[PDB]
Design a protein around this ligand. Structure first.
Ligand SMILES: [Ca+2]
Length: 1055
């Protein structure tokens, strides 16, 4: 007795065709209908299918809260209750409320069944259902005891959640896949369950399936196969073909058929493959195929699909139609492959607190089957690891030799490409310094010590001033002060200034420059030098406090998310953006920008960097549209070049107004007389964040300008007015005197009837509080307040020091993310810069930080590759050859670089060692889900072999990569040897107190010269962003987890 038949007595039962077992207490799908058979003696029960039905939501308050419940309801508003059969799946609804049950259990024929978290289809029999009982901890394990003191074993629901416990011991399984009655479930690090896919039974190779076996294990018989692994998109060559669904004939070498028509990874896929064919008229049948259908029926069904297929192949004398059917998209829907859970992003489990960008990451690992993509290293060696794209493994010796080789290329770009020596870069900027290994950072600085001797003297250090994207947390950097780091000014400004009226904290935070507890510099009484940490102050940058905020206007009146959009949508955004920026009340923009630039450009012990986007607007081309802040900013820069020097003394009086002041070259405190040049130097700033401020007639605000400035005339540089700020670049401006002491006394009245000299609250586009800058009258036409860096020898092993000489420098971040693409050669950014070389030198810019000049991948994966700023690149050696980059060609870059050298500036090469975008070539590697911190994530993806987009490069990487290494090892052999070093390490205190730094120790290995990364591959990467291929993309026998591989002694699936 096997199949559906009725016995001697009344009614009908069911028997497994395969085994012979009677179905009782189970679900089976026999031909058309789906049934349930009873616990009693298996007498059956019909579950009619529901075609046509609304599917919606209602409100129900049971007792506590009004919940909004989901319901099915048929066409006719009758809300369907109890167990129902819907599209050949079984979902369950509460018969009282009508609510859909998904991720839970239900009593049905004194038997508890479970429904998946997702769609809420019936997948398996659950063992026990517990609200009574409690947890226990025994032997360092976790377990669960019933109400009656005894243990629970196996798969049960504990307090509404699904969980599982070892059948022998009762140990709760955690962070592991496990099979229960052929169903694979995943249980998280906490222990809570989730269904994945029902596994097939896998039966004996019969008459028919004999001839669908693979012709041989050679490579020729298979295709679409990365590194010898079978993917879902693999076509194979059978031993024989069923010509026209009739004549079995030996297969020829030109014959191929798709693996997914004969083999499947789980029963889910197989059931969906059949019902898919039913839809597209390759299997005309009144039969219905569910997760409860007999394997025999499903496999027989799979053979009838081939019969019908082979007809259509015979007809069309080819198989391009099928390729199109299974693998390409149909009727604006995902393809058949992608529809499947095991072959899409849904089984990758994207997102999570730790997954900052592109929905998380995939940390590569090692595996016997994949000896090409295996790596001994892949250690992060820094606070963070993964950020974007394909994270490059910088712990690797060959990658460290390649990072030097690229450095040397950039540092000698002119000399290499065009034989032009004045066309080279001088300084660098390490992009994402906390995201790359310290070894290559250490080794990077060593190159700059070896090639330019920056440690020797501050004259040589200052000519090649480099900097990073980090605070004190970049330990390798701060240890010997090899580069500048970002001050806390930006943050400090963000609380006490950049917010709207009423949401601004007091300006006492701006007195000191502290990076979470540790002090960077204290402006209160800054009289000494060579003390503070070499740093750079900013308020905006290409990415910091802009992309966030610009995006804001883009999405409103446009809706496109900030990572991908059309040029039109961008242009429409920026319109509203700049249209808000010029207003008094600013939704998307920041307040008091000039006041903030005033601080940056007057504060001691910092090298401020100007942001292009604050002076010019991106609605127009490069240096095309001036911003509202332009005049204000140009004046302050001009003030700095001529006046700002000497010591600093900043305070906040009782009225709430910052009073920064500088005393001039030589003079370090308010009592110091100083040299004759001091008299016409040093300015005084007054700032305020109360636009509703109104001092009364008795109130007096003062600026003690110092003992050098007794009885001297002082003229305004910047003055707050009703409409904005009255700028002044010359002694032609309102003036005011100091008393016998040396003190500019102001008040709510005008100074000698000079309008706009009085102190008061004001609300206007360029300032929401008060801003006034004052310098001494009688400056020379060619005065300079800047101190020239000594050729003086340094023995203390520091590179950069904070002194007059360094504070004389002024960096310029000369690009934006949201520039439009030029329409002509003249409108391109690197030509414009070359034209306007003197315009920067006049403002007193010393360092000019260009945009990474690398060809963008233009894959619209992330913002950086949407708007093509140059951080998103494949060939990192291509700086605009042949076809231009956003900024220019390689000819235009060399023209720019020389234009800056001729205008006495240094040029910064922005170095991105972290990641690389869009590498077309494919490889198989073991990947596991991870977060920025290079940490394993507890996901149902687990650890799988994944086809990653890791092989690639470009024409110019082939050419240049690795080539200058043997050169370099000759000249500077110390770069290539091993080396011990020290670096700081930020510790976060658990008790909610301030962090603290501790000296850590490091040892970089030696590196090779001979080995060259001509192109990238898996083995030189730490990992890759989630690609969305799927958990089961590299195919494997999910019963036992054996991967398929093509060797002489292959592990073939068609078997
Ligand atoms: Ca990294």
């Amino acid at each position: 007795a096997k199949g559906l038949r009725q016995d001697s007595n009344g009614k009908l039962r069911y028997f497994d065709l395969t085994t012979g077992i009677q179905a009782k207490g189970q679900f089976v799908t026999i031909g058309q209908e789906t049934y349930y058979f009873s616990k009693d003696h298996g007498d059956a029960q019909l579950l009619p299918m529901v075609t046509e039905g609304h599917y919606g939501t209602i409100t129900l308050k049971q007792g506590q809260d009004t919940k909004t419940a989901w319901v099915y309801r048929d066409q006719n508003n009758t809300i369907l209750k109890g167990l129902q059969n819907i599209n050949g799946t079984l979902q369950f609804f509460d018969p009282y409320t009508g609510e859909q049950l998904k991720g839970g259990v239900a009593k049905y024929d004194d038997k508890l069944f479970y429904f998946e978290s997702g769609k809420g289809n019936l997948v398996s029999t659950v063992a026990g259902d517990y609200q009574d009982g409690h947890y226990i901890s025994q032997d360092g394990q976790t377990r669960y005891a019933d109400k009656q003191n005894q243990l629970v074993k196996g798969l049960v629901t504990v307090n509404g959640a699904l969980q599982y416990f070892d059948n022998a011991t009762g140990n709760q399984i955690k962070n592991q896949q496990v099979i229960v009655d052929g169903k694979t479930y995943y249980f998280d690090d906490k222990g809570n369950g989730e269904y994945l896919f029902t596994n097939t039974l896998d039966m004996s190779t019969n008459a028919f399936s004999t001839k669908n076996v693979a012709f041989n294990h050679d490579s020729s018989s298979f295709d679409h196969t990365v590194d010898g692994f079978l993917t879902a998109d693999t076509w194979y060559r059978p031993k024989s073909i069923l010509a026209n669904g009739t004549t079995w004939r030996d297969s020829t070498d030109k014959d191929m058929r798709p693996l997914i028509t004969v083999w499947w990874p789980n029963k889910n896929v197989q059931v969906n493959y059949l019902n898919f064919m039913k839809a597209n008229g390759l299997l005309t049948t009144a039969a219905q195929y569910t997760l409860h259908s007999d394997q025999y029926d499903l496999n027989q069904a799979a053979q009838d699909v081939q019969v019908a297929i082979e007809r259509r192949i015979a007809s069309e004398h080819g198989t391009d139609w099928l390729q199109k059917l299974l693998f390409e998209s149909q009727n604006n829907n995902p393809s058949f492959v992608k529809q499947q859970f095991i072959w899409n992003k849904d089984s990758e489990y994207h997102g999570g607190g730790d997954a900052w960008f592109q929905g998380g990451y995939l940390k590569y690992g090692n595996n016997p089957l994949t000896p090409t993509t295996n790596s001994d290293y892949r250690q992060p060696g820094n606070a963070f690891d993964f950020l974007l794209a394909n994270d490059v493994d910088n712990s690797n010796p060959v990658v460290q030799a390649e990072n030097l080789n690229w450095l040397h290329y950039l540092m000698n770009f002119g000399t290499i490409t065009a034989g032009q020596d004045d066309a080279n870069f001088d300084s660098i900027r390490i992009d994402a310094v906390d995201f790359i290994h310290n070894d290559t950072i250490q080794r990077t600085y060593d190159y700059l010590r070896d090639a330019y001797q920056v440690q020797q003297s501050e004259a040589k250090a200052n000519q090649h001033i480099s900097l990073v994207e980090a605070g004190l947390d970049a330990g390798t950097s701060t240890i010997h002060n090899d580069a500048l780091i970002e001050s806390n000014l930006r943050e400090a400004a963000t609380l006490s200034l950049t917010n709207e009226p009423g949401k601004n904290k007091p300006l006492t935070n701006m007195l000191q420059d502290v990076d979470g507890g540790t002090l960077i510099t204290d402006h209160t009484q800054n009289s000494t030098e060579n003390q503070a940490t070499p740093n750079y102050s900013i308020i905006h940058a290409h990415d910091k406090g802009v992309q966030e905020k610009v995006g804001a206007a883009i999405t409103d009146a446009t809706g496109a998310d900030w990572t991908n959009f059309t040029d039109e949508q961008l242009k429409a955004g920026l319109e509203l953006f700049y249209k808000d920026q010029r207003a008094t009340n600013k939704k998307y923009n920041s307040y008091n920008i000039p006041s903030i630039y005033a601080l940056m450009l007057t504060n001691k012990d910092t090298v401020p960097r100007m942001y292009y986007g604050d002076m010019y607007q991106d609605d127009g081309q490069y240096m095309a549209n001036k911003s509202i802040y332009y005049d204000a900013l140009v004046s302050l820069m001009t003030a700095r070049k001529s006046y700002v020097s000497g010591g600093q003394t900043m305070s906040v009086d009782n009225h709430g107004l910052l009073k920064s002041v500088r005393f001039g070259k030589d003079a370090m405190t308010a009592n110091d007389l100083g040299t004759s040049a001091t008299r016409t130097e040093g300015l005084g700033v007054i700032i305020g964040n109360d636009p509703k401020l109104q001092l009364n007639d008795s109130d007096k605000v003062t600026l003690d300008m110092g003992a050098a400035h007794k009885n001297q005339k002082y003229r305004a540089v910047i003055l707050t007015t009703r409409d904005g700020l009255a700028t002044f670049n010359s002694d032609q401006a309102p003036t005011a005197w100091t008393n016998d002491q040396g003190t500019l006394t102001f008040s709510n009245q005008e100074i000698n009837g000079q309008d706009n000299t009085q102190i008061r609250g004001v609300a206007n586009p360029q300032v929401s509080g008060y801003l006034a800058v004052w310098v001494p009258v009688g400056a020379s036409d060619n005065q300079d307040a800047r101190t020239a860096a000594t050729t003086t020898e340094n023995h203390d092993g520091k590179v950069l020091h904070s002194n007059a000489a360094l504070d004389s420098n002024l960096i310029y971040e000369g690009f934006s993310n949201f520039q439009p693409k030029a329409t002509t050669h003249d409108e391109l950014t690197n030509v414009v810069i070359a034209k306007n070389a003197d315009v920067f030198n006049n403002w007193g810019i010393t360092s000019f930080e260009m945009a990474p000049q690398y060809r963008s991948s233009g894959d619209h994966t992330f913002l950086d590759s949407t708007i093509d700023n140059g951080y998103a690149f494949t060939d990192r050696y291509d700086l605009g050859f042949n076809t231009p980059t956003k900024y220019g060609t390689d000819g235009d870059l060399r023209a720019t670089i020389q234009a800056l050298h001729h205008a006495n500036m240094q040029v910064m090469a922005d170095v991105v060692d972290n990641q690389v975008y869009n590498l077309p070539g494919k490889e198989v590697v073991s990947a596991t889900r991870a977060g920025v911190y290079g940490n394993d994530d507890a996901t149902g993806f687990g650890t799988q072999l994944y086809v990653t987009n890791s092989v690639g490069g470009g024409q110019y990487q082939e050419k240049y990569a690795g080539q200058y290494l043997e050169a370099l090892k000759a000249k500077y052999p110390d770069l290539f040897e091993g080396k011990a070093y020290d670096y700081w390490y930020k510790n976060y205190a658990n008790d909610g107190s301030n962090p603290y730094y501790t000296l850590s120790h490091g040892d970089r290995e030696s590196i090779p010269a001979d080995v060259a990364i001509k192109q990238w591959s898996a083995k030189y990467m730490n990992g890759t962003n989630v690609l969305g291929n799927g958990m089961g993309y590299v195919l494997k026998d999910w019963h036992n987890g054996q991967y398929f591989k093509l060797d002489g002694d292959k592990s073939t699936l068609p078997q």
